[PDB]
């Protein structure tokens, strides 16, 4: 691996597809799913999370949900990310 963008914006975009959320998950329920592998950071991979997803609304590839299901909801968009 010499070039990767974010092993965990990568896992971000895979958690979102395992759950599917049409409506948009939370930060917190997205990290709930994201904690569950042994190479993820259990201390600071909130904030690698949070700016993972940040990172990736900025690029289209996340849409930016808020309101209906908690303050800071997200999902997928599509390959929009490289295209």
């Given at each position: 691996s010499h070039m990767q963008p974010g092993k965990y914006s990568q896992l971000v975009v895979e958690t979102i597809r395992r759950l599917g959320e049409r409506n948009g998950s939370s930060l917190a329920k997205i990290y709930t799913e994201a904690k569950?592998?042994?190479?993820?950071?259990?201390?600071?991979g909130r904030t690698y999370l949070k700016y993972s997803i940040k990172a990736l609304v900025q690029n289209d590839t996340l849409l930016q949900v808020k309101g209906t299901g908690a303050n800071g909801s997200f999902k997928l968009n599509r390959k929009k990310l490289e295209g």
């Open positions: 569950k592998v042994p190479w993820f950071d259990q201390q600071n």
